[PDB]
Ligand binder design. Structure first.
Ligand code: FES
Ligand SMILES: [K+]
Ligand SMILES: [K+]
Ligand SMILES: [K+]
Ligand SMILES: [K+]
Ligand SMILES: [Mg+2]
Ligand SMILES: [Mg+2]
Ligand SMILES: [Mg+2]
Ligand SMILES: [Mg+2]
Ligand SMILES: [Mg+2]
Ligand SMILES: [Mg+2]
Ligand SMILES: [Mg+2]
Ligand SMILES: [Mg+2]
Ligand SMILES: [Mg+2]
Ligand SMILES: [Mg+2]
Ligand SMILES: [Mg+2]
Ligand SMILES: [Mg+2]
Ligand SMILES: [Mg+2]
Ligand SMILES: [Mg+2]
Ligand SMILES: [Mg+2]
Ligand SMILES: [Mg+2]
Ligand SMILES: [Mg+2]
Ligand SMILES: [Zn+2]
Lengths: 38, 43, 101, 18, 122, 38, 222
RNA sequence: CCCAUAGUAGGCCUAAAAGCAGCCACCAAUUAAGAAAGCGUUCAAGCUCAACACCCACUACCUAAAAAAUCCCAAACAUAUAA
RNA sequence: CUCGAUGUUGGAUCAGGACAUCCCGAUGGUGCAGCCGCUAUUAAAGGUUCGUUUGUUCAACGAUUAAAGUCCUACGUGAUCU
RNA sequence: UGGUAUAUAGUUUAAACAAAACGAAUGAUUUCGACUCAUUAAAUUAUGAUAAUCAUAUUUACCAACCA
């Protein structure tokens, strides 16, 4: 992913989800929008 | 780990001191006395 | 309509919806028909028919689905929501489609 | 090491007059 | 710079809701004080240490009686955070010559002229 | 020592730190929460 | 039947001839020769100037004290002039250009040897002052985006406001002081020198009332 | 969540400028929908948004991190009436 | 702090440790077809060359390697040496 | 790595609103040429802001540096 302290969606298909104790951003359309909470 | 640079309670980077609950009450107890002192010094 | 259009009515042969408008338990069936009768779903399979026969016999509503394989699916919508009817409808599409191919 | 400049201001050493 | 403090006058103005809390009477003010030091003069300015000597408050928790007049009150406003002020009450009145040796100052602020040291029969 | 104005938050004297802790806003609390009431 | 609402009309608003922000020079026209003391009390305490709106309706409020050099003015200027519509907006400066000289000694020199040479100039700012004021045929939601973006890059705590939010901020703080259930306040104690507390306080604490600590402002303090 | 027809490719500029390089206007059909808010096309196409319908998404808009070198560092505890 | 003495460059010898990973391991993204690479997450068990000139640390150069890592340890270590 | 200087016709070189010089062309001149004179063509490292001045990175020049 890319570690981010301020998560932000970059398109309509990005969705927030809390996993392993921290927030993530996943995107099936554009996998480069993926972010990990730092 | 956990060094306080220099001496603890002086200088720029000091060891943090936190206010307990009884420390608050002890100060409030003193205030209530001196607030009643103002009343008797007014007549 | 969107969720059902991505799938497509490929295996389906005919769909029949009967309901009694004056009865007070046909909102579910009428909502099911509102989506299946959309241009997005109907376009995926022109051969697949969609028929609506209105009745006023005081009878319960049902959805009868004819497949190409010959199997049939019936959903009595008196105590079923549109989402429940649509969901079950989609699951059968996926199963029957895989069986044919 | 590196030498530094001096102050250019002189005087100002008068004492109070009371 | 650290200096002496000027206490505003409005601080020493009892409100109506203050008289129904401490039990005082603005029309009939009390005549004498009962001052008692409850704080150390160490770590305080020298001008506070001198006032404590003028008022005879060297030893702590030792009741001393002073007059409720402006000049005395002024000295008290400088060390009002080192002392406890309480009015002197006289339920039996002023001690007579025959009672000087029978008195006792209670914690309530009352001066009783008959210290019998015996259970009340009531 | 340190000046009165600093780029960093300067540690208070313990007497002041205690004062700031006693003189904290206390919001009113109604006996019954307004949501529980009609 | 989704209920529609009337909309405000800005036809009555006028736009100047140079709505964009003018350029700020690094140093004043004539360079200064007399070197000045640090005078840190120019950013300490509440501001007594530029605390109210004059022409516009939206602005950037300073929530703390600091010094502004040229690098800050360029960021504000470019960022605002790029993101704003010159036709329906206008902006003005609420702060003067850098005038306070900042001396600095050369690298490697030891303590002493006089005073340093003038290096750059700054503009002192106190808490509660307006830095930039905007206005025109626009709502607040439009400018609030890039104004907060600007406020975050400033060396002090800042925030975008409007004539309404600023007023509401001030009325809510007064409401807190009135309904505060705590019988003990910083003002009452300090002014009366209760507990000998003025031995650890400052003379400014009589007026700041605990809401300021150096250059930092604490809005949650009553 | 849902849904999208039309005067018209508005005018001018432009090799071309079609809701979306610029300037001017920003009127109008249909119960309902900006002479277009965000992508996109060499220009067009194409995907969304604001609209109608349906009926209750009937939200929050107040704060976002952390790493050094001999070996972490009292042990432990959320519920029996402020002493 | 130490001048009634805390022996100071580099090297030899023996290495302890950190991870901000040079190689080997596990993963996400890519303007990742593949072979090579860029970037980030995780991982410190194991390992991290021989030589010419220079007192050198560095640096250049030659030949190699899966890689020839960055740092601290009184610029680790002279009652062990040089 | 560090800062300090750096840029102008095709080249060469004062200065930025573009000056001169070599070479080029053109005539004037000579029996024909050289020389000379006159004329003509010909440029500002490129990027972002002030509006033509500061920045931006390049560009090549210029000195600095383990230590005992
Ligand atoms: S508890 Fe009273 S409203 Fe939920
Ligand atoms: K310290
Ligand atoms: K900031
Ligand atoms: K166009
Ligand atoms: K020594
Ligand atoms: Mg220490
Ligand atoms: Mg003098
Ligand atoms: Mg003198
Ligand atoms: Mg000081
Ligand atoms: Mg046209
Ligand atoms: Mg157009
Ligand atoms: Mg279109
Ligand atoms: Mg376009
Ligand atoms: Mg149109
Ligand atoms: Mg427009
Ligand atoms: Mg919509
Ligand atoms: Mg010795
Ligand atoms: Mg790691
Ligand atoms: Mg290792
Ligand atoms: Mg050593
Ligand atoms: Mg030896
Ligand atoms: Mg040794
Ligand atoms: Zn995405």
């Amino acid at each position: 992913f890319k570690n981010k302290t301020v998560l932000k969606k970059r398109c309509k298909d990005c969705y927030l989800v809390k996993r392993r104790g921290r927030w993530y951003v996943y995107c099936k359309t554009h996998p480069r929008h993926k972010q990990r909470q730092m | 780990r956990g060094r306080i640079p220099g001496r603890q309670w002086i200088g720029k980077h000091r060891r943090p001191r936190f206010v307990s609950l009884r420390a608050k009450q002890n100060m409030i107890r003193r205030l209530e006395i001196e607030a009643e002192n103002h009343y008797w010094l007014s007549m | 309509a969107a969720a059902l259009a991505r799938l497509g009515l490929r295996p389906v042969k005919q769909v029949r919806v009967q309901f009694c408008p004056f009865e007070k338990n046909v909102e579910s069936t009428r909502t099911f028909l509102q989506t299946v009768s959309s241009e997005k779903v109907r376009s995926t399979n022109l051969n697949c028919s969609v028929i609506a026969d209105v009745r006023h016999d005081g009878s319960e509503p049902c959805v009868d689905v004819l497949f190409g394989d010959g199997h049939r699916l019936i959903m009595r919508g008196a105590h079923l929501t549109a989402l429940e009817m649509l969901t079950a409808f989609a699951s059968h599409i996926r199963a029957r489609d895989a069986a044919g191919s | 090491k590196k030498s530094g400049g001096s102050s250019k201001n002189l005087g100002g050493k008068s004492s109070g007059r009371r | 710079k650290f200096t002496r403090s000027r206490i505003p006058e409005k601080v020493f103005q009892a409100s109506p809701e203050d008289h129904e809390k401490y039990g005082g009477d603005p029309q009939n003010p009390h005549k004498l004080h009962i001052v008692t030091r409850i704080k150390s003069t160490r770590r305080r300015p020298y001008w506070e240490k001198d006032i404590i000597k003028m008022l005879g408050l060297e030893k702590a928790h030792t009741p001393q009686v002073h007059k409720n007049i402006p000049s005395v009150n002024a000295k008290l406003k400088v060390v009002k955070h080192l002392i406890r002020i309480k009015p002197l009450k006289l339920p039996q009145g002023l001690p007579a010559e025959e009672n000087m040796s029978n008195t006792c100052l209670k914690s309530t602020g009352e001066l009783v002229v008959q210290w019998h040291l015996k259970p009340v029969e009531q | 020592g340190s000046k009165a104005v600093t780029r960093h938050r300067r540690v208070m004297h313990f007497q002041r730190q205690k004062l700031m802790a006693v003189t904290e806003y206390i919001p009113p609390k109604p006996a019954i929460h307004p949501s529980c009431l009609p | 039947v989704k209920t529609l609402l009337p909309v405000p009309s800005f036809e009555d608003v006028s736009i100047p001839e140079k709505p964009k922000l003018r350029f700020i020079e690094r140093a004043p026209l004539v360079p200064k020769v007399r070197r000045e003391p640090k005078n840190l009390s120019d950013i300490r305490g509440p501001s007594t100037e530029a605390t109210e709106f004059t022409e516009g309706n939206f602005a950037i409020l300073a929530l703390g004290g600091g010094y502004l050099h040229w690098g800050h003015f360029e960021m504000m200027r470019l960022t605002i002039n790029r993101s704003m519509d010159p036709k329906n907006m206008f902006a003005i400066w609420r702060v003067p250009a850098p005038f306070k000289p900042i001396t600095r000694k050369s690298v490697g020199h030891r303590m002493g040897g006089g005073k340093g040479a003038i290096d750059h100039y700054v503009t002192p700012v106190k808490a509660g002052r307006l830095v930039v004021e905007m206005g025109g045929r626009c709502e607040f939601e439009e400018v609030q985006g890039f104004l907060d973006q600007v406020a975050h890059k400033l060396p002090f705590a800042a925030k975008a406001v409007s004539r309404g939010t600023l007023e509401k901020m001030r009325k809510d703080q007064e409401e807190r002081e009135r309904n505060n259930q705590n019988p003990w306040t910083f003002e009452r104690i300090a002014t009366a020198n209760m507990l000998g507390i003025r031995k650890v306080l400052s003379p400014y604490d009589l007026t700041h009332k605990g809401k300021y600590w150096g250059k930092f402002y604490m809005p949650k303090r009553v």
